[PDB]
Amino acid sequence: YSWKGLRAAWINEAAFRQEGVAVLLAVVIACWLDVDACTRVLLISSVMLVMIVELLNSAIEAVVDRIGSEYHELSGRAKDLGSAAVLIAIIDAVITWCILLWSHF
Amino acid sequence: GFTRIIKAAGYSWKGLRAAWINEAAFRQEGVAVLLAVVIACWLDVDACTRVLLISSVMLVMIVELLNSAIEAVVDRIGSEYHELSGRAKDLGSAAVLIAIIDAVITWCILLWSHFG
Amino acid sequence: FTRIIKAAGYSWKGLRAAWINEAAFRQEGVAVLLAVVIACWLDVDACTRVLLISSVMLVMIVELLNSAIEAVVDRIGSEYHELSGRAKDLGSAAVLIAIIDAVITWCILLWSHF
Ligand SMILES: Nc1ncnc2c1ncn2[C@@H]1O[C@H](COP(=O)(O)OP(=O)(O)CP(=O)(O)O)[C@@H](O)[C@H]1O
Ligand SMILES: CCCCCCCC/C=C\CCCCCCCC(=O)OC[C@H](O)CO
Ligand SMILES: CCCCCCCC/C=C\CCCCCCCC(=O)OC[C@H](O)CO
Ligand SMILES: CCCCCCCC/C=C\CCCCCCCC(=O)OC[C@H](O)CO
Ligand SMILES: CCCCCCCC/C=C\CCCCCCCC(=O)OC[C@H](O)CO
Ligand SMILES: CCCCCCCC/C=C\CCCCCCCC(=O)OC[C@H](O)CO
Ligand SMILES: CCCCCCCC/C=C\CCCCCCCC(=O)OC[C@H](O)CO
Ligand SMILES: [Cl-]
Ligand code: NA
Ligand code: NA
Ligand code: NA
Ligand SMILES: [Zn+2]
Ligand SMILES: [Zn+2]
């Protein structure tokens, strides 16, 4: 499952690796900045949220491919919707980091 | 290959229109969400509070999009197969509810502490 | 308002379904109750209290989405007779990251308070 899924996500999905690095960067940076606990949490969790949604998107993509590689309007709808969910998470992470850092750095 | 980043962006945007055009729940929650975001940007609150007000509400949109994706998959199954238990869609609806409840709690707790 | 009652009944049906079939959801249900009580019984500020609860609530949300994905796979698995696991693996991975995130949240916040 989880550890197995993470391994699959890392090797197979390139977007996931970039997020993994981003999580590592977020944690290191959040710990290096002189900020309060809530801020430190918000900096890390927001980026981890992107990874969570990305994994779910990858899961949906796996189901759709399993149904069929062939082209349908509901197959690509699902993948688009999943892709859209990741975007909002990223938008959320950008807004979060902006608001917090605009005050400190 | 920065070119692909644009490929992925077009996807998400296509998904957004699809959620908007096809899902009514997405249209109504989006209005409440976008309204909430605007208010959160204009309140006299600290950064952490402003972030919590926005993120809790945007999470509702994230979960809804994931719910819509799951519904799309189910509908894809339903076009080939005849019998739909509805269980997958029920769970997706449950996920959105918990997200909305969470957003209500977040806004209640935060607004009650500063303005209380 | 008619659809809202219908959408709520769906959600409630999904919540009840999750409770009976998945033991992990019952544990998370317990954890949410504990998180709220603990956050409300500690003398902490609003932002930390929101984060203590929301981090745990996120785990329940991801689990519900994961269970939905599992249900779809099973419906397909009943038709094609296929036992590939990536959809279920990835869904479980998403829940793990949510749990790890919640642990970090509780650690960082409580280490700062105490
Ligand atoms: N079976 C299918 N039927 C219809 N459209 C499909 C499809 N498979 C893919 N598409 C379309 O192509 C896009 C890319 O497919 P897919 O979602 O699998 O991308 P991907 O895994 O390469 C990138 P990412 O993981 O970042 O989302 C989808 O967003 C959708 O618009
Ligand atoms: C104001 C500055 C704030 C900076 C900090 C904000 C938080 C980090 C943002 C996103 C995490 C993930 C990064 C983007 C993930 C890759 C994008 C993607 O999915 O692209 C398609 C794929 O890469 C095909 O190659
Ligand atoms: C104060 C308010 C400031 C607000 C500022 C907000 C500006 C937009 C921010 C980030 C966009 C980053 C680029 C978009 C990310 C790539 C597209 C995407 O979502 O790709 C997912 C991909 O398919 C993988 O699954
Ligand atoms: C202590 C007093 C404090 C009071 C402050 C409370 C403010 C709640 C704020 C945001 C919730 C946002 C929820 C966004 C999603 C809900 C959408 C929804 O359910 O909409 C109803 C539907 O449209 C009908 O037809
Ligand atoms: C201050 C800024 C306020 C901004 C405006 C906020 C207005 C709405 C508030 C609460 C509505 C709560 C609604 C709760 C009903 C949920 C129904 C449900 O379970 O829906 C499942 C979902 O629709 C499946 O997609
Ligand atoms: C500060 C205010 C805090 C407010 C409190 C936080 C609310 C958390 C939300 C949902 C929990 C739902 C738990 C799952 C319930 C499922 C239904 C159930 O128990 O079903 C069993 C059934 O009886 C078998 O026959
Ligand atoms: C400070 C310790 C106080 C003692 C009591 C703590 C309980 C409060 C809940 C969560 C804490 C953070 C844990 C992070 C994950 C929470 C959800 C979780 O682990 O749920 C069970 C899981 O699904 C596997 O079955
Ligand atoms: Cl059980
Ligand atoms: Na159609
Ligand atoms: Na729907
Ligand atoms: Na299960
Ligand atoms: Zn993919
Ligand atoms: Zn995709």
Author numbering:
A (entry chain C): 16 to 120
B (entry chain B): 6 to 121
C (entry chain A): 7 to 120
Verbatim from the authors:
The enzyme has long served as a model for integral membrane enzymology, folding, assembly and stability. It is a trimer with three active sites of the shared sites type that exhibits moderate positive heteroallostery, random-binding kinetics and lipid substrate promiscuity.
Therefore, the enzyme was co-crystallized with the non-hydrolysable ATP analogue, adenylylmethylenediphosphonate (ACP). Best crystals, providing a ternary complex structure with ACP and lipid bound at 2.7 Å resolution, were obtained with Δ4-DgkA grown in 9.9 MAG at 4 °C and soaked with zinc-ACP. Like the apo-enzyme, the ternary complex is a homo-trimer. In the complex, asBC has zinc-ACP and lipid bound. The zinc-ACP is close to fully extended and is secured by electrostatic, hydrogen bonding and hydrophobic interactions along its length on the relatively flat, cytosol-exposed surface of H2C and H3C. They are bidentately coordinated, respectively, by the β- and γ- and the α- and γ-phosphates of ACP and fasten the polyphosphate to conserved residues Glu28C and Glu76C in the active site in ways that make catalytic sense. The two hydroxyls of ribose in ACP are tightly hydrogen bonded to the side-chain carboxyl of the essential Asp95C. MAG1 has been modelled into the electron density map with its headgroup deep in the protein positioned at the level of the membrane interface with its reactive 1-OH next to the γ-phosphate of ACP. This is what was observed in the ternary complex where the two entities are poised for reaction ∼4 Å apart.
